[PDB]
Symmetry: C2
Subunit: 101 residues, 2 copies
Protein backbone atom coordinates (compact mmCIF):
# COMPACT_ATOMS: atom_id res chain seq x y z
CA UNK A 1 0.00 0.00 0.00
CA UNK A 2 1.69 3.16 -1.28
CA UNK A 3 1.95 6.59 0.34
CA UNK A 4 -1.01 7.43 -1.88
CA UNK A 5 -2.87 4.25 -0.84
CA UNK A 6 -2.98 5.54 2.72
CA UNK A 7 -4.12 9.01 1.63
CA UNK A 8 -6.72 7.31 -0.50
CA UNK A 9 -7.98 5.38 2.57
CA UNK A 10 -8.32 8.51 4.68
CA UNK A 11 -10.10 10.53 1.96
CA UNK A 12 -12.56 7.66 1.79
CA UNK A 13 -13.27 7.76 5.52
CA UNK A 14 -13.68 11.53 5.37
CA UNK A 15 -16.02 11.25 2.39
CA UNK A 16 -18.07 8.80 4.44
CA UNK A 17 -18.31 11.41 7.28
CA UNK A 18 -19.30 14.08 4.76
CA UNK A 19 -22.03 11.88 3.24
CA UNK A 20 -23.51 11.58 6.72
CA UNK A 21 -23.25 15.35 7.33
CA UNK A 22 -25.01 15.78 3.96
CA UNK A 23 -27.76 13.35 5.00
CA UNK A 24 -28.27 15.51 8.10
CA UNK A 25 -28.42 18.70 6.03
CA UNK A 26 -31.13 17.08 3.87
CA UNK A 27 -33.14 16.01 6.90
CA UNK A 28 -32.91 19.54 8.35
CA UNK A 29 -33.96 21.12 5.05
CA UNK A 30 -36.89 18.72 4.91
CA UNK A 31 -37.72 19.62 8.53
CA UNK A 32 -37.75 23.33 7.63
CA UNK A 33 -40.33 22.77 4.91
CA UNK A 34 -42.47 20.50 7.07
CA UNK A 35 -42.52 23.23 9.75
CA UNK A 36 -43.22 26.05 7.28
CA UNK A 37 -46.03 24.03 5.71
CA UNK A 38 -47.58 23.38 9.12
CA UNK A 39 -47.14 26.97 10.35
CA UNK A 40 -49.10 27.98 7.22
CA UNK A 41 -51.76 25.36 7.92
CA UNK A 42 -52.26 26.67 11.44
CA UNK A 43 -52.17 30.35 10.54
CA UNK A 44 -55.15 29.68 8.29
CA UNK A 45 -56.71 27.72 11.13
CA UNK A 46 -56.77 30.87 13.22
CA UNK A 47 -58.08 32.93 10.33
CA UNK A 48 -60.99 30.48 10.18
CA UNK A 49 -61.47 30.72 13.94
CA UNK A 50 -61.32 34.52 13.93
CA UNK A 51 -64.14 34.51 11.36
CA UNK A 52 -66.07 31.94 13.35
CA UNK A 53 -65.69 34.18 16.41
CA UNK A 54 -67.08 37.16 14.48
CA UNK A 55 -70.07 35.06 13.47
CA UNK A 56 -70.91 33.85 16.95
CA UNK A 57 -70.56 37.51 17.97
CA UNK A 58 -73.01 38.80 15.36
CA UNK A 59 -75.35 35.95 16.30
CA UNK A 60 -75.09 37.08 19.92
CA UNK A 61 -75.67 40.72 18.98
CA UNK A 62 -78.85 39.43 17.30
CA UNK A 63 -80.28 37.71 20.40
CA UNK A 64 -79.49 40.99 22.18
CA UNK A 65 -81.61 42.90 19.65
CA UNK A 66 -84.52 40.51 20.25
CA UNK A 67 -83.93 40.93 23.96
CA UNK A 68 -84.22 44.70 23.59
CA UNK A 69 -87.45 44.41 21.62
CA UNK A 70 -88.80 42.14 24.36
CA UNK A 71 -87.85 44.51 27.15
CA UNK A 72 -89.65 47.20 25.15
CA UNK A 73 -92.71 44.93 24.83
CA UNK A 74 -92.66 44.55 28.63
CA UNK A 75 -92.57 48.31 29.30
CA UNK A 76 -95.40 48.93 26.84
CA UNK A 77 -97.41 46.23 28.60
CA UNK A 78 -96.80 47.96 31.94
CA UNK A 79 -97.91 51.28 30.42
CA UNK A 80 -101.07 49.61 29.08
CA UNK A 81 -101.77 47.91 32.42
CA UNK A 82 -101.67 51.27 34.25
CA UNK A 83 -103.80 52.92 31.54
CA UNK A 84 -106.54 50.27 31.90
CA UNK A 85 -106.37 50.38 35.71
CA UNK A 86 -106.90 54.12 35.50
CA UNK A 87 -109.89 53.66 33.16
CA UNK A 88 -111.48 51.13 35.56
CA UNK A 89 -111.09 53.57 38.49
CA UNK A 90 -112.65 56.32 36.36
CA UNK A 91 -115.64 54.11 35.48
CA UNK A 92 -116.09 53.08 39.10
CA UNK A 93 -116.31 56.78 40.12
CA UNK A 94 -118.82 57.35 37.32
CA UNK A 95 -121.06 54.38 38.33
CA UNK A 96 -120.96 55.60 41.90
CA UNK A 97 -122.09 59.10 40.82
CA UNK A 98 -124.76 57.68 38.51
CA UNK A 99 -126.21 55.49 41.26
CA UNK A 100 -126.55 58.64 43.43
CA UNK A 101 -128.68 60.55 40.89
CA UNK B 1 -139.67 53.33 33.24
CA UNK B 2 -139.05 54.92 36.64
CA UNK B 3 -136.40 57.44 37.68
CA UNK B 4 -134.53 54.37 38.91
CA UNK B 5 -135.12 52.52 35.62
CA UNK B 6 -133.09 55.17 33.81
CA UNK B 7 -130.31 55.06 36.41
CA UNK B 8 -130.37 51.31 36.10
CA UNK B 9 -129.91 51.61 32.31
CA UNK B 10 -126.91 53.92 32.63
CA UNK B 11 -125.18 51.80 35.30
CA UNK B 12 -125.54 48.91 32.89
CA UNK B 13 -123.86 50.78 30.05
CA UNK B 14 -121.07 51.88 32.38
CA UNK B 15 -120.61 48.34 33.64
CA UNK B 16 -120.27 47.26 30.02
CA UNK B 17 -117.48 49.89 29.52
CA UNK B 18 -115.78 48.69 32.70
CA UNK B 19 -115.90 45.03 31.60
CA UNK B 20 -114.06 46.08 28.45
CA UNK B 21 -111.49 48.10 30.43
CA UNK B 22 -111.04 44.98 32.60
CA UNK B 23 -110.53 42.81 29.50
CA UNK B 24 -107.79 45.23 28.45
CA UNK B 25 -106.15 45.09 31.88
CA UNK B 26 -106.09 41.28 31.62
CA UNK B 27 -104.56 41.38 28.15
CA UNK B 28 -101.87 43.81 29.37
CA UNK B 29 -101.10 41.67 32.41
CA UNK B 30 -100.82 38.65 30.13
CA UNK B 31 -98.55 40.69 27.83
CA UNK B 32 -96.29 41.56 30.77
CA UNK B 33 -95.77 37.90 31.60
CA UNK B 34 -95.22 36.90 27.98
CA UNK B 35 -92.52 39.60 27.74
CA UNK B 36 -90.89 38.69 31.06
CA UNK B 37 -90.85 35.02 30.08
CA UNK B 38 -89.23 35.83 26.75
CA UNK B 39 -86.71 38.30 28.22
CA UNK B 40 -85.67 35.41 30.52
CA UNK B 41 -85.45 33.02 27.58
CA UNK B 42 -83.15 35.38 25.69
CA UNK B 43 -80.99 36.32 28.66
CA UNK B 44 -80.15 32.63 28.97
CA UNK B 45 -79.56 32.57 25.22
CA UNK B 46 -76.75 35.06 25.65
CA UNK B 47 -75.36 33.18 28.62
CA UNK B 48 -75.12 30.16 26.32
CA UNK B 49 -73.49 32.26 23.61
CA UNK B 50 -71.02 33.85 26.03
CA UNK B 51 -69.92 30.33 27.03
CA UNK B 52 -69.77 29.25 23.40
CA UNK B 53 -67.57 32.28 22.71
CA UNK B 54 -65.21 31.30 25.52
CA UNK B 55 -64.94 27.83 24.04
CA UNK B 56 -64.14 28.95 20.52
CA UNK B 57 -61.58 31.25 22.16
CA UNK B 58 -59.86 28.46 24.11
CA UNK B 59 -59.95 26.35 20.95
CA UNK B 60 -58.25 29.22 19.12
CA UNK B 61 -55.68 29.66 21.88
CA UNK B 62 -54.94 25.95 21.32
CA UNK B 63 -54.21 26.24 17.59
CA UNK B 64 -51.97 29.17 18.58
CA UNK B 65 -50.02 26.90 20.95
CA UNK B 66 -49.52 24.36 18.15
CA UNK B 67 -48.50 27.23 15.91
CA UNK B 68 -45.86 28.28 18.44
CA UNK B 69 -44.50 24.74 18.69
CA UNK B 70 -44.30 24.65 14.89
CA UNK B 71 -42.48 27.96 14.64
CA UNK B 72 -40.07 26.53 17.21
CA UNK B 73 -39.66 23.37 15.11
CA UNK B 74 -38.79 25.62 12.14
CA UNK B 75 -36.10 27.57 14.02
CA UNK B 76 -34.53 24.36 15.32
CA UNK B 77 -34.49 23.04 11.76
CA UNK B 78 -32.70 26.20 10.61
CA UNK B 79 -30.17 25.80 13.44
CA UNK B 80 -29.60 22.17 12.41
CA UNK B 81 -29.27 23.11 8.73
CA UNK B 82 -26.50 25.63 9.52
CA UNK B 83 -24.78 23.14 11.87
CA UNK B 84 -24.64 20.47 9.12
CA UNK B 85 -23.52 22.99 6.49
CA UNK B 86 -20.69 23.96 8.81
CA UNK B 87 -19.71 20.30 9.31
CA UNK B 88 -19.64 19.72 5.52
CA UNK B 89 -17.35 22.76 5.03
CA UNK B 90 -15.09 21.46 7.81
CA UNK B 91 -14.86 18.01 6.16
CA UNK B 92 -14.15 19.56 2.77
CA UNK B 93 -11.20 21.49 4.27
CA UNK B 94 -9.98 18.27 5.88
CA UNK B 95 -10.18 16.22 2.63
CA UNK B 96 -8.34 18.98 0.83
CA UNK B 97 -5.54 18.90 3.45
CA UNK B 98 -5.41 15.10 3.43
CA UNK B 99 -5.10 14.97 -0.36
CA UNK B 100 -2.08 17.32 -0.07
CA UNK B 101 -0.13 15.04 2.30
Amino acid sequence: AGHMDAIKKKMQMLKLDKENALDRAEQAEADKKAAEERSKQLEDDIVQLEKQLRVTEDSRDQVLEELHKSEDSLLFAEENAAKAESEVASLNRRIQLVEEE
